[PDB]
Amino acid sequence: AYFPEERWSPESPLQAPRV
Amino acid sequence: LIALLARNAAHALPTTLGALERLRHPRERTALWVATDHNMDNTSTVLREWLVAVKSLYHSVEWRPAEEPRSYPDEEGPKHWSDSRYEHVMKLRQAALKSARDMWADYILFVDADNLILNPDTLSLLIAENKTVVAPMLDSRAAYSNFWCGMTSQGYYKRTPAYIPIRKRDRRGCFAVPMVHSTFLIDLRKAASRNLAFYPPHPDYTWSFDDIIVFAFSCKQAEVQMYVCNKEEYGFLPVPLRAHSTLQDEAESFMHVQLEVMVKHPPAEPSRFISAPTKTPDKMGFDEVFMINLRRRQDRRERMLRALQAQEIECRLVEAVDGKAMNTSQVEALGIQMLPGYRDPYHGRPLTKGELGCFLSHYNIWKEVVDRGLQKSLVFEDDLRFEIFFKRRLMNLMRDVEREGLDWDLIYVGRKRMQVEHPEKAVPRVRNLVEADYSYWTLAYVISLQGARKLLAAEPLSKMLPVDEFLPVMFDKHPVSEYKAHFSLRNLHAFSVEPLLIYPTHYTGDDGYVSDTETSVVWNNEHVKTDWDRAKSQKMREQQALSREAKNSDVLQSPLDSAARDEL
Amino acid sequence: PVNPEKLLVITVATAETEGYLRFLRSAEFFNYTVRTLGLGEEWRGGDVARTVGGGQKVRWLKKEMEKYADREDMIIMFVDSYDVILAGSPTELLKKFVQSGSRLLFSAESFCWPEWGLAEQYPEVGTGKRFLNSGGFIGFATTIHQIVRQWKYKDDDDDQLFYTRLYLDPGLREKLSLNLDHKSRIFQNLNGALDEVVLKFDRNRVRIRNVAYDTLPIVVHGNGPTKLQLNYLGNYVPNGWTPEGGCGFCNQDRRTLPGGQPPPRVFLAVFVEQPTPFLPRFLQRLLLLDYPPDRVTLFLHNNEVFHEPHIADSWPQLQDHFSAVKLVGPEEALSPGEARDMAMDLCRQDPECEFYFSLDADAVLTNLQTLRILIEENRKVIAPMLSRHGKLWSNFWGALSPDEYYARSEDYVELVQRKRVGVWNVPYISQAYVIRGDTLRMELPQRDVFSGSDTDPDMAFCKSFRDKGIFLHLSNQHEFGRLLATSRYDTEHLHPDLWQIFDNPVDWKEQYIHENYSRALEGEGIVEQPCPDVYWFPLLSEQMCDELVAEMEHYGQWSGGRHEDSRLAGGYENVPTVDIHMKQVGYEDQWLQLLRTYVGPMTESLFPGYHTKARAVMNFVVRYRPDEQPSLRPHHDSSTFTLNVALNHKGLDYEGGGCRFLRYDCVISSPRKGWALLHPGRLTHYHEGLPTTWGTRYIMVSFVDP
Ligand SMILES: O=c1ccn([C@@H]2O[C@H](COP(=O)(O)OP(=O)(O)O[C@H]3O[C@H](CO)[C@H](O)[C@H](O)[C@H]3O)[C@@H](O)[C@H]2O)c(=O)[nH]1
Ligand SMILES: *[C@@H]1O[C@H](CO)[C@@H](O[C@@H]2O[C@H](CO)[C@@H](O)[C@H](O)[C@H]2NC(C)=O)[C@H](O)[C@H]1NC(C)=O
Ligand SMILES: O=c1ccn([C@@H]2O[C@H](COP(=O)(O)OP(=O)(O)O)[C@@H](O)[C@H]2O)c(=O)[nH]1
Ligand SMILES: O=c1ccn([C@@H]2O[C@H](COP(=O)(O)OP(=O)(O)O)[C@@H](O)[C@H]2O)c(=O)[nH]1
Ligand SMILES: *[C@@H]1O[C@H](CO)[C@@H](O)[C@H](O)[C@H]1NC(C)=O
Ligand SMILES: *[C@@H]1O[C@H](CO)[C@@H](O)[C@H](O)[C@H]1NC(C)=O
Ligand SMILES: O=C(O)CCC(=O)C(=O)O
Ligand SMILES: [Fe+2]
Ligand SMILES: [Mn+2]
Ligand SMILES: [Mn+2]
Numbered sequence A: 001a002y003f004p005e006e007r008w009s010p011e012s013p014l015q016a017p018r019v
Numbered sequence B: 001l002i003a004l005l006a007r008n009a010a011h012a013l014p015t016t017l018g019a020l021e022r023l024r025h026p027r028e029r030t031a032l033w034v035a036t037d038h039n040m041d042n043t044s045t046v047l048r049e050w051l052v053a054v055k056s057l058y059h060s061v062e063w064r065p066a067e068e069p070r071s072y073p074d075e076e077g078p079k080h081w082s083d084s085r086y087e088h089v090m091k092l093r094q095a096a097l098k099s100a101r102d103m104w105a106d107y108i109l110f111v112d113a114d115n116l117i118l119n120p121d122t123l124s125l126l127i128a129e130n131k132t133v134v135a136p137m138l139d140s141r142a143a144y145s146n147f148w149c150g151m152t153s154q155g156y157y158k159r160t161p162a163y164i165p166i167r168k169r170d171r172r173g174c175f176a177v178p179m180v181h182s183t184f185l186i187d188l189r190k191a192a193s194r195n196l197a198f199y200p201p202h203p204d205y206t207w208s209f210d211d212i213i214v215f216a217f218s219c220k221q222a223e224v225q226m227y228v229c230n231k232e233e234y235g236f237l238p239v240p241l242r243a244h245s246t247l248q249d250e251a252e253s254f255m256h257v258q259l260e261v262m263v264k265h266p267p268a269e270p271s272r273f274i275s276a277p278t279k280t281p282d283k284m285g286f287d288e289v290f291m292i293n294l295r296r297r298q299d300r301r302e303r304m305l306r307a308l309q310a311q312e313i314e315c316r317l318v319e320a321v322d323g324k325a326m327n328t329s330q331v332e333a334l335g336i337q338m339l340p341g342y343r344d345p346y347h348g349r350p351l352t353k354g355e356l357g358c359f360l361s362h363y364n365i366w367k368e369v370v371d372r373g374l375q376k377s378l379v380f381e382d383d384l385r386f387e388i389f390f391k392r393r394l395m396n397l398m399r400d401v402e403r404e405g406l407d408w409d410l411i412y413v414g415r416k417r418m419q420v421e422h423p424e425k426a427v428p429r430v431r432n433l434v435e436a437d438y439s440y441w442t443l444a445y446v447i448s449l450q451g452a453r454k455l456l457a458a459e460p461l462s463k464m465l466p467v468d469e470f471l472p473v474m475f476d477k478h479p480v481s482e483y484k485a486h487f488s489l490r491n492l493h494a495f496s497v498e499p500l501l502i503y504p505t506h507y508t509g510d511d512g513y514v515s516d517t518e519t520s521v522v523w524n525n526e527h528v529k530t531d532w533d534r535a536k537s538q539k540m541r542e543q544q545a546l547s548r549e550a551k552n553s554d555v556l557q558s559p560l561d562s563a564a565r566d567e568l
Numbered sequence C: 001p002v003n004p005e006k007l008l009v010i011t012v013a014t015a016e017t018e019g020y021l022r023f024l025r026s027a028e029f030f031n032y033t034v035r036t037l038g039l040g041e042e043w044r045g046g047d048v049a050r051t052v053g054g055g056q057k058v059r060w061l062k063k064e065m066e067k068y069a070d071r072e073d074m075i076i077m078f079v080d081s082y083d084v085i086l087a088g089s090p091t092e093l094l095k096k097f098v099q100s101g102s103r104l105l106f107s108a109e110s111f112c113w114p115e116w117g118l119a120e121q122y123p124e125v126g127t128g129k130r131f132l133n134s135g136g137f138i139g140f141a142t143t144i145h146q147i148v149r150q151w152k153y154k155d156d157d158d159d160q161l162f163y164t165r166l167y168l169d170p171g172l173r174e175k176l177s178l179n180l181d182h183k184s185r186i187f188q189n190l191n192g193a194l195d196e197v198v199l200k201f202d203r204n205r206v207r208i209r210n211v212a213y214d215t216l217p218i219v220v221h222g223n224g225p226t227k228l229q230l231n232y233l234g235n236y237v238p239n240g241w242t243p244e245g246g247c248g249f250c251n252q253d254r255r256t257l258p259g260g261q262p263p264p265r266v267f268l269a270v271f272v273e274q275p276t277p278f279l280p281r282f283l284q285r286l287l288l289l290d291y292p293p294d295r296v297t298l299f300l301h302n303n304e305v306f307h308e309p310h311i312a313d314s315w316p317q318l319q320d321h322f323s324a325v326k327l328v329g330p331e332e333a334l335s336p337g338e339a340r341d342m343a344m345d346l347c348r349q350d351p352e353c354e355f356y357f358s359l360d361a362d363a364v365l366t367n368l369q370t371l372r373i374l375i376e377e378n379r380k381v382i383a384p385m386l387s388r389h390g391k392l393w394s395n396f397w398g399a400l401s402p403d404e405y406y407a408r409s410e411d412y413v414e415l416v417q418r419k420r421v422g423v424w425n426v427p428y429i430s431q432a433y434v435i436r437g438d439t440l441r442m443e444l445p446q447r448d449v450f451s452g453s454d455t456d457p458d459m460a461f462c463k464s465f466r467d468k469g470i471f472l473h474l475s476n477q478h479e480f481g482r483l484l485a486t487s488r489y490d491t492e493h494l495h496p497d498l499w500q501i502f503d504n505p506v507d508w509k510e511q512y513i514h515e516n517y518s519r520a521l522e523g524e525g526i527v528e529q530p531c532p533d534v535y536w537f538p539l540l541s542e543q544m545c546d547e548l549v550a551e552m553e554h555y556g557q558w559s560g561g562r563h564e565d566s567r568l569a570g571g572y573e574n575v576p577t578v579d580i581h582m583k584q585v586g587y588e589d590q591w592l593q594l595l596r597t598y599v600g601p602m603t604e605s606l607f608p609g610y611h612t613k614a615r616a617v618m619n620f621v622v623r624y625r626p627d628e629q630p631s632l633r634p635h636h637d638s639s640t641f642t643l644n645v646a647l648n649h650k651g652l653d654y655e656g657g658g659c660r661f662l663r664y665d666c667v668i669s670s671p672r673k674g675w676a677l678l679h680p681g682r683l684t685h686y687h688e689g690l691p692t693t694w695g696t697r698y699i700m701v702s703f704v705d706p
C-alpha cells in the first residue's frame, strides 16, 4: 500500500471552565 | 491522576514506586488509582503497605483488589495473552479513564509496573508540550521502545526508515507517530478528548483484537495525533518475553534493566516505605571467583560490587600489583625479562607497565589456583557489562560441558574477534561453544587445573608480553610464527562462547575511557609516557567490523537466547 | 534574495497529453515562467524508456541556448514534462540552490541505467544517493551553455551516458563546479525511494516529505516503472484536494450543453452476458433516461439463452423509442471480448460517434441524470462510482499489485464511503464509463483491445488504455447508484427473483414490497382500524401477489381436508383446510426473513410496549372454493396474533366475504389485494370467516409468535 499520511489535526479548542 | 495496573509485579514494585514518588510535582495536586488482581506473588501486600504509608500526603487514593481468582481459565501460562486478559485490561483502563473524567482533573498519566521513570522532571516536561496525547521515548537494551512507525494492513508493526534516526537520537523534537503505548499522557481539558475510549471498539473496527491497536483506531477516528519525543533521557523499560516463559524469566529481565541503569547513572535507589527482599548469594557451583582491582581506582569497584550483589554472586576479591609504581629493583628480583624481539603489533612501542602489573596479577591468580588445586575458577576485571540471563546461561553451559566431558582448559567468555572470515568449527554434541581463534581482551575466562598446570609448566617468567597476545600463542593460532618458534609446547585447548556474554563498558575514543595500561611509561626508563591513542586506537569494536558474512549459524543454540515481540 | 523573475523553467513536450497539462497547472499555481520546446514536431527518437532514447532533447536545448549564451543574470532549470509535478515555490527553490552553492546540481538516483561498468568510478557517498540522473538539473546560463555545446551525435543516441561521461572527468567537474543533490533536497526520484516519501497535509495545500533525510523536495519525478505512483500523488500535490477546500480542478471545463442545437450524439451500449437479477426492471428503466431519443443509438448484446423472453417482450418499446436500435442474439456464438470490440468498432468507424457510454447490465443507475453530468465533465474517460450495498466492493481499484491484479490502496475506504469528493485518477475502472469519440478515432486506432489475449477483457482494456498515456478518471461527487450481486442465482424456478431477499434486499424491496408501506409505517394515515383492536395496512404489491399465486398453483398438490394430519407432530387437526405449507415449496426461510424485517417494526409501533422476534412455525396459503370446501366454523388461533394477507381482487375473480367477529358483531366486507390484517387471536377475538359463492379466493396466513 502506498503513500502513508500525516493528516491536519489542528489543536482542539479548550473546554469552558468548571463552576 | 496517576493510574497503575499491577499483576505479578512484586519484584519490580519497590524501585519503580520509589522513582515515581520523587516526581517534581506538588503532592497535593495528585491522585492515585492503584488496581491489582490475578496475581501469584504478594504484590497486593506490598501495594497495600505503600498505600497505607503514603495515603496521607496525596489528594485521594483509590484501591480495587480482586485477589480471587489467581489465573484465567483458558490460558497456557502467566504470559499467555488470552482474549479474556485483553478484555479485562480494556475494562480496567476504560474505568480508570472514566473515573479521571468525573473527578475534574486534567491530564492522566498511564504508568505500568515495569516502566522505570527515572527523570524527576518527566511530568513537567510532558505537561509543557501542549498536546493531547504525548509519550516519552523510553530506552531499552535492544531496538525495542514504546512507539511504532507504521501499520501494515491490519495493525501490525512495519519498520519505517525514520525509526533508527529517532530511536538512536539522531533527531530531536516531537514527532507524530501512529502508536504510543506503555507510558503516555492524555490531556483532559481539550474538547477532542471526549471521544477517546479504551474498551468499546469503534463501529468501523474490523482489525484484530489486540488491546493497543483499538486505542490507535479510536485516536485516528477522533482526529487527534499521538506524539512521542526524546529531547532528553527519561527512563528504561524491559523487553517483553515469549508467551511461554515463567515469572523467574521476568524477574531476571527486570534485574538486567536495573544493571543497565547503573552503567552510566547513579544506582536507582529503592523507595523508603517498602523494603527489598535481600537475597543470599551463591557460588555458581564454581570453586572460586576472583576479581582483580586497583586500590587507587575506587569508583570502578563499587559498581562492580553492586552488579555482583544484584546477580546473587559472591566475590573472593584479590588486590593488584601496582606497576606504574614498580621500579627495576623489584622488577628484576623475580627475573622479569622483556621478550627477545618484541614490540607493539600496532605501534612499535616495546612494552608498558600496566600490562606488566596485569600479567603479574594473572600469574599470581594462576599460581594460587594451582597451589590450592581448584578444578575450575572464574576470573574477572573492572569494566564489565553482563548480558541478560548471565548466571543461568553460564550454569547451563558449564553443566553441559562438564557432563559431556572433554579436554577443556580455557573457556573464554569475553573476547574480540578481529579474524573476520569464514566461520570456525563447532565442537560436536555440545551447544553454544565454538573453537578458539585469535582474540584480544581477556576480560574473563574460566581457568582449569590442567590448563593452569600446563601454563605454569610453560614457565613464562623470562618471556614478557601482554596477556591478550600471550594466550593465542599457546594454542597455535597466532599469525606470526616467530613468536611460536620462540616457544616449545602449545598443548592448550582453548574454547569460547559464540553468543558472547560479557562486553566492556567503555570503548576506545568514547566518553569516560580511562585505561590503567596502554597509557603509561615503558617497562624500562622513566621519561617515555605514551598518550592515549586518539586516531591510532585500533581497538574500537569487533561488532560493526563483523557486520558481514560471519555466519557461525551451524552451532546448536540453547533454549534460551530468544525474546522480543513486535518491534524487532 | 535572488530575484524570482530571473528563473526560466524549460521543458520538452512534442504533444499536449494530460501529463503535460497537469505539469502546466502545477507550475502556473506557484507563478513560474515555463517555456516549452518543440511543440508540434515529430518525436525523432524511439521508445520512450524501453531500451534507449532521449537524444533529441539535448539537440533542441543546444539550439535554444544560443540566445542565452551571454546572459549571466539568469538561472535555467530543465525538467521532463510528462511525468513531473512541482511541489514548492520559486523563492524556496532559489534559496536552496544558493545554499547548495554549486553552479550545476543534477538529480541523484540509486541505479546505473544505461551502462553498468562505470559504477566504481563515481565518488563515494555515505548515506545519500550516489549516481547521476538526467531527469532534472538547475544552474547558471553560462555553465549550461558550456555543458550543452559539446553535443554532436545521432538523433537516436542515448542521453544519460553523455552526461555521466562528462561528469566523471575530475578536471572538468572541478572546473565547472558540478555537483549532485545527494540527500534529495530539491529533486526527488520515485524509483528506489518509494518507501521514504509520505504525504504531508496542510491547511490549504499538500506537500511531500522525505522521512529518511527529513528534507522536503521541490520537484517530484516518477521515472522508470513508477508512473502509477505519480498518478496517485497527483490527486493531492499541490492543490488537488485540501482538507477545507474540497477538490481543485474538479468542477471546471464544463460544457453545460449550450447552443440550442440538440445535444451531442451518444452511442449507448448495453452488455448482458450472465443471468442477472431484475433484468426487466433495468430494461424498463432504460427508457427513463433524461436524454432525447433522436440522438441515442443502442447496441444490446445478449449472451444467455435464459434472457431471451425478457428482451423479446421488451423489444417493441425500445425499437419505437430510440433513433436506431440493433440486437445481437446468443445464437451467433460470440465471445464477450469480440462483442465489445465490435461495439467500439461500430462507433469508431461512424463519424457521428461523439461519445460512447458502455453500460453493463449489473449496474443499477438510481440517478437519472448521470449521462448529462458525465458528458458535461469533458474528460477523455470518466466513470461514476457504484458500490455494493453494505460492503466495500466497487468498480475501481486503488492500486496495482506486481502481478497486475488487485492490491488495496491507502485511501480506498475513504473514497468508497464518500468522505472525500472529487474527480480522482485510478488505474482501473469498469462496468460504466464514458469514452470520448475522437480518442477512439485518432488516439487508439487499433481494433483489438479486449480480445487477443488470455486475460479478462476488462483488465486488457484498462492495460491498453494506461499504456498509451491516458488517464482514467472516476467521479464520486453525487450518488450514481449501486451494483447488483450476481455471484449465485438459481434459475430452476418459475420466477427466480422471489428468492432474492438475501442477496439484493434493496431491489427486492423496491419491486415486491408495497409502495405505500413506508408512509404507513411513518404514521401519516393509511393504516385503518375498522373494528376494535384489528388493523389494516398494506404490505405486498401486485407483482408479489400474482407471482406467489402462480408459483403455488404450479405446485398442484393442494393437500389438506382430512381431520388427521401427517405434517403435524401431534397428528390431528382441530379444523382442516386445503393448504400448501411453505416448507413444501421451499419458501419458508424467505418468508421468515420477510416477517422478521418488515412486519416486526410496524407491529411494534402499532402496539407500544411490545417487543417481537417474529418467530413463527405455522404459515400457509388457503384456497376457498364453493365446490371443494366452504368457509370455516367459529374458532380461535394458537398464536399471539395472526397476519391475514389477501392475494387477489374482490369481485373481479371471486364474490365472497372476509372475517366476522362474534364478540363485536364486526363484519369485514371488502378486503383489498395487498393489504394485511392484524389482530390478537388467542383470547378476545372469536372470529369466523365468511363463505364464498362465485369464483376462487386466496389468503395467506401466518400464526406468528405461537
Ligand atoms: O490482570 C491484569 C492486571 C494488570 N496487568 C498489567 O498489564 C501490564 C502489561 O505489562 P507486561 O509487562 O505483562 O507486558 P507487555 O510488555 O507484553 O505489555 C505490552 O503489550 C501488552 C500486549 O500488547 C499490552 O498492550 C501492554 O499494555 C503493553 O505495554 C502490567 O502492568 C501488568 O501488571 C495485566 O497484565 N493483567
Ligand atoms: C495550547 O494550545 C491551544 C490550542 O487549542 C491554545 O489555545 C489557544 O489560545 C489562544 C489564546 O487567546 C486563542 O487565541 C486560540 O484561539 C486558542 N486555540 C484554539 C485552537 O482555539 C493554548 O493557548 C495553548 N497553550 C499555551 C500555553 O499557549
Ligand atoms: O598496576 C596495575 C595493576 C593492575 N592493572 C590491571 O589493569 C586492569 C584494568 O585496566 P583496563 O581494563 O582499564 O585496561 P584496558 O585493558 O581496558 O585497556 C585491572 O584488571 C588490573 O588488574 C594495571 O593496569 N596496572
Ligand atoms: O511521445 C513522446 C514525445 C516526447 N517525449 C519526451 O521525452 C521525455 C522523456 O520521457 P519520460 O519522462 O516519459 O522518460 P523516463 O524518465 O521514463 O526515461 C519526456 O519528458 C518528453 O518531453 C516522450 O516521452 N514521448
Ligand atoms: C505571485 O502570486 C500572487 C498571488 O496570485 C500574484 O498576485 C502575484 O502577482 C504573483 N507574482 C507574479 C510574478 O506573477
Ligand atoms: C398509495 O397511496 C396513494 C395515496 O395518495 C394512492 O393514490 C395510491 O393509489 C396508493 N398505491 C396503491 C394503492 O398501490
Ligand atoms: O378466512 C379468513 O379470513 C379467516 C380464516 C382464518 O383466520 C383461519 O382460517 O384461521
Ligand atoms: Fe385464525
Ligand atoms: Mn513491559
Ligand atoms: Mn579497562
Ligand SMILES: [Mn+2]
Pocket: C080, C082, C083, C084, C135, C221, C222, C223
Ligand atoms: Mn520522466
